[PDB]
Amino acid sequence: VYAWNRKRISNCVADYSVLYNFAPFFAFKCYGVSPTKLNDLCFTNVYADS
Amino acid sequence: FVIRGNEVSQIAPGQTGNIADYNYKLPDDFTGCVIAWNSNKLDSKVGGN
Amino acid sequence: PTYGVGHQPYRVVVLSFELLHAPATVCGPKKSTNLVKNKCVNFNFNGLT
Numbered sequence: 001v002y003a004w005n006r007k008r009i010s011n012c013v014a015d016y017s018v019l020y021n022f023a024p025f026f027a028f029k030c031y032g033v034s035p036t037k038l039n040d041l042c043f044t045n046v047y048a049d050s
Numbered sequence: 051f052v053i054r055g056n057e058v059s060q061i062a063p064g065q066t067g068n069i070a071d072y073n074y075k076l077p078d079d080f081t082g083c084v085i086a087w088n089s090n091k092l093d094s095k096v097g098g099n
Numbered sequence: 100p101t102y103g104v105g106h107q108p109y110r111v112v113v114l115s116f117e118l119l120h121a122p123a124t125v126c127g128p129k130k131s132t133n134l135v136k137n138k139c140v141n142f143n144f145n146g147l148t
């Protein structure tokens with residue numbers, strides 16, 4: 001957590017409904033947007049911190 | 051019914067997905083209750099259920 | 100059973116309720132008192148207070 005891994009995601013087509021097949025998590029917490037509508041709107045860059 | 055644990059949030063008014071669009075859809079003016087509980091020991095088989 | 104939680108099976112019961120438009124058939128435990136007319140009283144009629 002002191003050296004959290006940041007990865008830039010750009011120039012691709014995202015399908016967030018595939019994400020539920022990757023990890024066993026209950027909910028998909030979101031501030032600003034909704035997990036239902038994330039396939040509709042689209043963004044410039046997506047930054048994944050781990 | 052029986053649903054996977056990451057899809058219980060789809061059982062709500064105003065939600066769409068796989069199950070909320072193809073299997074079980076709730077109305078937006080819903081007046082009711084949704085009860086969910088883990089049943090891994092009753093619905094889990096080591097060879098796959 | 101070796102799957103992580105969130106992929107484990109869950110059991111869901113959805114209780115859909117029908118509001119009071121017909122005469123009521125499902126009413127829980129509450130004893131009904133005698134009817135009092137021509138007096139300013141508090142009244143409860145099938146959940147309507």
Ligand SMILES: *[C@@H]1O[C@H](CO)[C@@H](O)[C@H](O)[C@H]1NC(C)=O
Nearest residue numbers: 018019020021022023024103
């Ligand atoms: C993760 O990668 C390994 C090796 O490529 C594979 O066996 C495993 O199924 C993958 N798991 C997921 C959830 O993609």
